[PDB]
Design an enzyme around this catalytic site. Structure first.
Site, PDB file in Angstrom:
ATOM      1  N   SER A   1      -6.516   5.135  -0.642  1.00  0.00           N
ATOM      2  CA  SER A   1      -5.520   4.255  -1.163  1.00  0.00           C
ATOM      3  C   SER A   1      -4.558   5.012  -2.082  1.00  0.00           C
ATOM      4  O   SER A   1      -4.060   6.015  -1.706  1.00  0.00           O
ATOM      5  CB  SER A   1      -6.179   3.071  -1.846  1.00  0.00           C
ATOM      6  OG  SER A   1      -5.250   2.139  -2.167  1.00  0.00           O
TER       7      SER A   1
ATOM      8  N   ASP B   1      -4.410  -2.930   8.369  1.00  0.00           N
ATOM      9  CA  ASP B   1      -4.630  -2.848   6.913  1.00  0.00           C
ATOM     10  C   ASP B   1      -4.029  -4.057   6.190  1.00  0.00           C
ATOM     11  O   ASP B   1      -2.832  -4.333   6.306  1.00  0.00           O
ATOM     12  CB  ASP B   1      -4.040  -1.532   6.373  1.00  0.00           C
ATOM     13  CG  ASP B   1      -4.508  -1.197   4.951  1.00  0.00           C
ATOM     14  OD1 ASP B   1      -4.488  -2.073   4.068  1.00  0.00           O
ATOM     15  OD2 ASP B   1      -4.867  -0.027   4.710  1.00  0.00           O
TER      16      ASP B   1
ATOM     17  N   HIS C   1      -8.559  -2.259   4.976  1.00  0.00           N
ATOM     18  CA  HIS C   1      -8.241  -1.254   3.973  1.00  0.00           C
ATOM     19  C   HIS C   1      -9.473  -0.554   3.459  1.00  0.00           C
ATOM     20  O   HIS C   1      -9.471   0.667   3.309  1.00  0.00           O
ATOM     21  CB  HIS C   1      -7.479  -1.907   2.827  1.00  0.00           C
ATOM     22  CG  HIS C   1      -6.905  -0.927   1.836  1.00  0.00           C
ATOM     23  ND1 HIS C   1      -5.968  -0.009   2.170  1.00  0.00           N
ATOM     24  CD2 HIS C   1      -7.145  -0.766   0.470  1.00  0.00           C
ATOM     25  CE1 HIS C   1      -5.646   0.711   1.079  1.00  0.00           C
ATOM     26  NE2 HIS C   1      -6.364   0.243   0.040  1.00  0.00           N
TER      27      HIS C   1
END
Lengths: 311, 312
Positions: free
Chosen positions: B105, B181, B218
């Site tokens: 991330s 995502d 994610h």
């Protein structure tokens, strides 16, 4: 579809009553109730405080919810007793008037289980508005809550629901979902293959309306501005289902609903946080819970904790 | 790109050092370190305990991580000081040997910001293995954390990274991401438009390998069996990037990585739980942090807390 008398509850009514709450009202004396059924790993307020509780209030409903213990991780059939009892109670408590049911995730599966196996409530539920329901479970171990087993694709529970007729809508139903859902799959086809799809339902896959580039996850499917517009349409419609005329491209806003306060928007974004925590902290087992006797005929040959379901 | 001397740190070195931890070792004396850079609203352990810490351990590394306070919610530029310092310190602590960086991330954005604006580490980072990096931020806040502002698409920070040449790989880089995502978009194009894409990088969109039916989120982009195989490839590869011959359709398992102990798989799914909570209880402001002078020229015309970004 199953017919005749409702099966007996495994829990006494007092236990089921304990799971039901209305905002500023008792279930026995409530104006315009809407029953909210939460997602896996959450209570009613955890699923809906940041979204449909205040949004349904501004639409003129009294939000009510069930919170089956522990955080919807127990057997889905028991979670459903809470929902069936709640409909009976809210119907009787609002002047014997039908009421809408609005759900997230497992909550839709619960609602549909209830309508399939407890015929008494079919006349009491006005409409169903389900966000990201997993009627076919999900394809996405030995470390799983009872209800996670039951929500696994190919489960005895999902098998039973399908064989009993539960994949066709029983009351006017709107299903809102995303091809990109990171919890519930398959959802990609915009067709009866999708876990959220019910025959004769108003099945709204967000990508069908918003385009094949459009992305919203499992929580967004409940909390988004797009979801609010579809939800409001379903609740307002004289047909019981959301109407295509009430939404379009310009409503394709994936972010938390506009009418929520800044605080509620932040909380809506964090929707899945307590769910994951509750799953980590919650009950887990290495097998799917047994079907109740009323459901067994519809999943003969499936394997549950006690063994193979027999005729 | 920028060339020349590293900019000065805003934070004291001892503060930066305090944010760096290695498993069963001091960063001053460590063998085979891998530097793990966490996601928004998490510490190092919260991002990686259930995944890349034990997996890099099983691959023969000493997992090290930064945990910039508070929970990666502060200015991404400050978070990068932690990373740059950690590289300098882990390079020295391993006998002047290059080290891999592995990220989730925002950690990837931090890595690339570091490589873009602090030239000294370019020769110190062996490779970058970035899972779901948000180099362009995300299209998915007047009470939002500093770093949440900076990770919004169109932010002054993402503008500055791009204009300084940071969307082209600087060291050998692999980017593993998903079109589906739910946190970082756009990712749908399997092309430079994707937030995770770096020119010249090994850009691995899950759906390009696994089909348009394949869905992974994610968190799963970091923790999955698929992600492990791709990550294992990048780390072991002689080119510094994951090789296509090391993975295929049979590796397309979206569930938590196989090698993980039964308890580590459970915690893997709950990856965003501390993240979303810390965002609720952390620092918040109604504006994007000002760009530090080294980055400011690349986002002239954007708006930050002090107003319109102007040339120095």
């Amino acid at each position: 579809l199953p017919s005749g008398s409702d099966p007996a509850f495994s829990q006494p009514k007092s236990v089921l009553d304990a799971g039901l709450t209305c905002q500023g009202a008792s279930p026995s004396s409530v104006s315009k109730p809407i029953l909210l059924v939460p997602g896996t790993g959450t209570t009613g307020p955890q699923s809906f405080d940041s979204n449909w509780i205040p949004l349904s209030t501004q639409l003129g409903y009294t939000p009510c919810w069930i919170s089956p213990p522990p955080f919807m991780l127990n057997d889905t059939q028991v979670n459903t007793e809470y929902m069936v009892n709640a409909i009976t109670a809210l119907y009787a408590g609002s002047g014997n008037n039908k009421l809408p049911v609005l759900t997230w995730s497992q909550g839709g599966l619960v609602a549909q289980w209830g309508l399939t196996f407890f015929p008494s409530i079919r006349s009491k539920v006005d409409r169903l508005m389900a966000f990201a329901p997993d009627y076919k479970g999900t394809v996405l171990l030995a470390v799983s809550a009872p209800s996670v087993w039951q929500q696994t694709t190919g489960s005895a529970l999902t098998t039973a629901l399908r064989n009993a007729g539960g994949l066709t809508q029983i009351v006017p139903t709107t299903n809102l979902y995303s091809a990109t859902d990171e919890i519930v799959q398959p959802q990609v086809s915009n067709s009866p293959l999708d876990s959220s799809y019910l025959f004769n339902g108003k099945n709204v896959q967000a990508q069908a309306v918003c385009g094949p580039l459009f992305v919203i996850g499992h929580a967004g499917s409940l909390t988004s501005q797009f979801s609010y517009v579809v939800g409001r349409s379903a609740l307002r419609s004289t047909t019981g289902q959301a109407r295509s005329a009430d939404y379009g491209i310009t409503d394709c806003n994936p972010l938390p609903a506009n009418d929520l306060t800044p605080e509620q928007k932040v909380a809506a974004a964090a929707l899945l946080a307590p769910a994951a925590a509750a799953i980590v902290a919650g009950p887990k087992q290495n097998c799917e819970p047994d079907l109740m006797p009323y459901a067994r005929p519809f999943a003969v040959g499936k394997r549950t904790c006690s063994g193979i379901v027999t005729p």
